[PDB]
């Protein structure tokens, strides 16, 4: 399926 | 940054 996107470590 | 997106595990 999804697997991730955006963490948030950098944004 | 980008982490991830579609696998290919399942799709
Ligand atoms: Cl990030
Ligand atoms: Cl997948």
Redesign the interface.
């Known amino acids: 399926x999804?697997?991730x996107x955006?963490?948030x470590?950098?944004?």
């Open positions: 999804i697997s955006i963490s470590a950098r944004i």
